[PDB]
Symmetry: D3
Subunit: 235 residues, 6 copies
């Protein structure tokens, strides 16, 4: 896997998954997508949105930044296209404010959909006012420098998950999940299948049908040894 942690390199061309597929994954959401690919790819639950009610997806443009150093953000902007999501990880843990409204302005100018950053962000009310969506480990006004080289479009570890450039990142109020570029098709189909099933179940549950009956659980619960008593005094 070789190129992880390597600095001083910008890879220009990456293979992206396709806009329509990406858009659909965003609408299905993180929980459904995660489940659809057999519960893999979920980033640390410490990666949190700075806004409420936004669910989206995009193709990962990856960035490795030195600790306390945001030099590679401007380098990465040039490599972004509409539909991309910038995915940034520091080379060692850091919660400084790597990113704010100026970089967000530049990203929006390129049609970038969001930032996922395994570090801190600032100018957060301005980011919300601009409608630029961010998932971050911290909110921190502490600034960074521009001294040490990192990389753009090499694989990175972000929130405990490997992210390859061009992988699809899906992000919503619950968290962030990565979908492998080559698995995008299978994951989308599986997630939609799950979504269809859940909608039928939701209607049945809303009508007052019990899940125990819907999912046919009662016999298996009894076989495991579930016992009902009328009153706690019976025990």
């Amino acid at each position: 896997n070789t190129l992880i942690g390597k600095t001083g390199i910008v890879v220009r061309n990456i293979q992206r998954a396709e806009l329509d597929s990406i858009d659909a994954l965003g609408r299905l959401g993180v929980a459904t997508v995660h489940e659809a690919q057999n519960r893999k790819g979920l980033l640390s639950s410490k990666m949190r949105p700075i806004q409420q009610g936004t669910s989206l997806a995009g193709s990962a443009v990856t960035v490795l930044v030195a600790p306390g150093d945001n030099w590679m953000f401007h380098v990465a902007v040039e490599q972004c296209r509409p539909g991309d999501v910038l995915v940034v990880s520091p080379s060692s843990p850091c919660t400084d404010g790597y990113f704010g409204d100026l970089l967000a302005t530049s990203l929006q100018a390129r049609g970038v959909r969001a930032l996922i950053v395994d570090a801190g962000v600032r100018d957060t009310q301005t980011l919300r006012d601009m409608g630029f969506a961010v998932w971050a480990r911290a909110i921190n006004a502490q600034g960074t420098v521009k001294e040490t080289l990192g990389s753009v479009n090499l694989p990175v570890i972000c929130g405990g998950q490997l992210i390859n450039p061009g992988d699809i990142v899906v992000a919503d109020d619950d968290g962030v999940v990565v979908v492998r570029r080559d698995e995008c098709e299978s994951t989308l189909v599986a997630a939609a299948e799950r979504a269809g099933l859940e909608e039928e179940k939701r209607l049945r549950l809303a009508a007052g049908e019990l899940g125990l009956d819907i999912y046919k659980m009662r016999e298996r619960l009894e076989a495991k040894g579930l016992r009902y008593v009328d009153n706690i005094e019976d025990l």
Copy 2:
């Protein structure tokens, strides 16, 4: 206290406190109720609401779930009545997503007012959209299984407090407090007494009367040895 931690049991009948009393406690709020019962019963401050501005109370239907296992949620739904609050604790610490919008749909169909869960929840924007109130230790899309039996309506430890089935749980933006079923009356009266006093004080404070004068503090402060100086250079 015996039955804590016991699995494979569902107690059907629990004695509930009464709807009007429960409703009043919800309106008075967590801080006032906690103070009214001599500062006992408060759950861990890590139990946080996923929404803002909701204050409520209900009769606890308790659930013990195995770690990473939400099997007992559907079992518990059947035992819930309008006005109940589902109170769930894992048998060992876990922040996986035990609960989302499908289970919330089922609970709302029974008139359940909220979930208090000493673990993770997901589908959180959908939960907010549905207006289903939740207090949780974590937001986490990571799913659970249905393999190991737990219990319903046995006592549980949730957020560091013992919760008996039928105890009253009061929850708001500040946190969650448990009121013992047999102490509901005394706590309600004490909380209302506090509320009446605080409203008079609030009016006096808003008018610009100082608490030092209102609460008659000045003489006791002087006796403890509080000393005023005009300028810091005097010291």
Copy 3:
């Protein structure tokens, strides 16, 4: 520095910075102000707002409180004037609910703009409803007592920063920064200079000019050894 940690003292007269200067710092915000004074004065990123979208500043009226003891809040109210911000630190770490809506009512009656507290707060929905802005380490309904003396208008350590009475505290969604009273002028000018520059840059970035070109970064990046490759297979 002597008087830090000393109890039983209230200093009545403090030299304040000036309202217009304070107001301007509030509008410029924490990140800009922090950067303007060479990245000093930022309080712990664990000091968080209980509301969204409020940015302000005021002259610090400082309070040292004993652990689990809010006695000095009422003592401090009397020493506050319009434009002040109450800045409170416990003498040892504590996240109990030191402050709620009654004290907030009293502070608003004096024209106090906010509370910064290195501990817990409660009645938080009421605080939001009143529009009383708070930055706190915790939300916690657990009450306090009034037994042990602290101090008012002596220097305190709050969020890892020394705060002298009359220093300017600037607070927004990103955090809280302290500006030394005697450095208020230089910091304001520097922050406004930064703000002017950033607004021009923002317009250029929004137009689609790259920061690499704007900030003249490309030659220095090449000199550090940044290398572009077309495809990841080239490596």
Copy 4:
């Protein structure tokens, strides 16, 4: 369960489990005992020993202390007998130094075997020098007061587990587990059964027999769909 959180009460007489049974549980250790009672009773993994290599058990003498208040420690000492373990929890979370070498001296004079405290301890090198074993949430020299009443020999929540007076607490380098007084016999027998089995297995494993063969796992692994490949390039 009623009496939890109640203050101002000392229960003099408690039913204890028996010394020999208690001693055996200590020798078997926390992991084995926990497993023997179907993985219940384990206190928070944040409860840690201040020493290395000590494993023991005793009958719980329980103490509820007010936050930052160790008044009840001296009250509790009088109620202790040889073989007891003092189990202390604050009425709300606190990591102050509740306990040090003087109280330890008094406990040792009564033949008390250890302290389990859901808070802080100090004088820790002296405690080690005396050979007084302690499990604590924190090491903290910050002192406490003696102003507010708590209780002795009422049930408490300690490390997230209910502890009744006279329950058996087993503590070692891995943590602390509570064994219900009335379940002491069954747990001891089950723990010894486990210990016997594990010793035979250990000898087989040391000889180089694989667990896959010992525990007869291979057929079930294949049935679940475990697939072997020679080289990673095969995938």
Copy 5:
């Protein structure tokens, strides 16, 4: 990078780095090795040794385990050879006790040098008594199950670093660093070069030569603007 997170697979044959090289890296230690490869490869500082004074290295045999499930440990033992270090990560965060003295006995029988586990361990005093070295995220007696398949000798993320099977893991009291199998030679040479330089410097420093003079820092410090004053009153 594809195979990360995949379950149900055991890769039998992995290319290992060489024993002598591995042994030398262990003697040089984590800090020196980390620095030698330009400060990459360091695992989370939360990965801590359960013993003091042991420094070692080995070839990684990687294991992905389901959360709360240690089934793959016994599967992995069979694939281990003398000199290997078992490197284990759960498919989602978990601090349960995955590993204790029985598995350690089996690993020692195969000549395995250590375990690195991004989760919990138990039987820790027995592990120390056996001299089986472990780096873990937690000490936790809470047991696991054997229900869900994982993988052996596929790449894993452990402590925030990608570990490929056959990579070299170096572990000591300061932490754990991964050295890429194909970079073993360059890293060893660089680490030894650093070690030689540091030993000469250490001798000079012990003799009382100042680093400012040794490393020729004084002129560069002055050029950056470092200013000496005799007394603090001069400022």
Copy 6:
């Protein structure tokens, strides 16, 4: 208080407290010293020793270092004299490895007694082997740079306490406390007074006299309303 956070300055001459007084404070220990000065000056309980059984004190030589930058350590060494303790804080939170065995060698050559660092340290087994005592926030092999100027012998905030150069820092297994240089005499006398009293009490407690009788607590406990019952069934 002005000079806090200022960079680019080295103050050469500081007034030190006196060796014998400092040595005595070290022998009395942190808890006793902290109590003697009315429970002030204690650093964060997160500042922990990397060794066991060492208690000491020294005159603070203070260092402000930039984040991830240890340049000022070598600058500070030159300003140290026998008996000094180096006290280091980063200008913003950082847990990188600022310090290891080379710097420790240089400090020992000057007769420096210890390091207190509000950040990370490495080479920790070597530090123990050398007998160089350290209190740190973290153990972390991640290296630092030498690019940004800090200060030496200006006041710093370390572990949440203001430390002036020449203040006395006392450090042991329980933590670290700062004693103001001008209060050294009063604190030493008060700490020795406490120590004398505690030794008499210890002898009485060891003999089996109860603290309730020794400290004359029984009447005050009864007056507060402490009630004894024989059996828990009485309630």
